[PDB]
């Protein structure tokens, strides 16, 4: 008895933002004028930013593999 | 008995931001004028930023493999 | 009995920000003017930054492998 | 002009577990038998426990109050 | 002009576990028998515990108050 | 002008575990028997514990108060 199975598979995952082109994205004009103005509660503000923010909790690879051979 | 299984597989994961091009991204004008202005609670502000922020809690590789052979 | 199983698999993970191009990124103009202005609570501020910030609590590699052979 | 507003409010918050009675809760019999047994990955186990676990990130109180009086 | 506003308010917060009664809680019988047994990764185990665990990152008090009076 | 605002408010926070009654808590029987038993990685174990563990990174008090009076 010959037991010769073969795994030759090519497996890829390519997830998120890949191969994009951004050409002169923030090229314009942004004007913010604020006067006599009041905040009672928590503020998050972005003006004219172009951040790359990347979070990867994913993208793991795992294999679990089992081999057994029994005579009786 | 000839037990000769083979794993030859190629596995990849490529996750997050890969191979992107940013050309002259923050090239424009940002003007922020603030006057007579008040905050009672916590502030986060970004003006004209271009940060690359990368978090990778993921991207782990693991193999679990088990072999057993019994005569009786 | 011949027990000659083989693992030849190639496994990679490549996660986060990889192979990106940033060309003249912060090239424009940022003006922030602040007058008569008040904060009672905690402030985080970025003006005109281009930080590269990388956190990798992930990216680990592990093998768990078990072999047993029994005669009786 | 008399400006004499009054706040007499009673405000209460009562959150989580309050005023419960637990009488002989763990009074029975718990038997665990484990033999020839294997773990490849991380274990959390409770047998026969009766913990009080209390987490309070909430339960703060704040007032913001503003008074202004103008002649012209 | 008389400007005599009053705050007489009572404000209370009571959060977590309060005023509970536990009578003979762990009073029964707990048996653990473990034999020929293996762990490859991290173990947390509780057998027969009755901890009080209390975490309070919350529960702060703050007043912000502003007074202004203008003659012109 | 009479400018006589008053704060008489009573403000309280009581967070975590308060006023609980634990009567003969650990009064029963806990038996642990362990044999031929193996750990490759980090262990935390409690058998028959009754800890009071209290963490308070919270629970602060603060006043911010501002007064200004302008003649022109």
Please, could you describe this protein's structure?
It is classed as protein fibril. The entry lists the keywords Amyloid, tau, protein fibril. It forms a hexameric assembly. Tau - CTE-MIA18 (tau intermediate amyloid). Six copies of one chain form a homohexamer. Chain A is mostly beta strands and 72 residues long. Chain A has strands spanning 2-3, 6-7, 10-18, 21-23, 29-39, 43-47, 52-55, 61-70. Chain A is elongated and about 90 Å long. At the A-B interface, strand 1, strand 2, strand 3, strand 4 and strand 5 of A face strand 1, strand 2, strand 3, strand 4 and strand 5 of B. Strand 4 (21-23) of chain D pairs parallel with strand 4 of chain E.
Summarize this entry quickly.
6 copies of one chain form a homohexamer. Chain A contains no helices and 8 strands.
Oligomer: homohexamer
| Largest sheet entry of chain A | none
- The number of distinct β-strands of chain A equals 8
What is the percentage of strand-forming residues of chain A? Answer: over 45%
Layout of helices and strands:
Six copies of one chain form a homohexamer.
Chain A: E1 2-3, E2 6-7, E3 10-18, E4 21-23, E5 29-39, E6 43-47, E7 52-55, E8 61-70
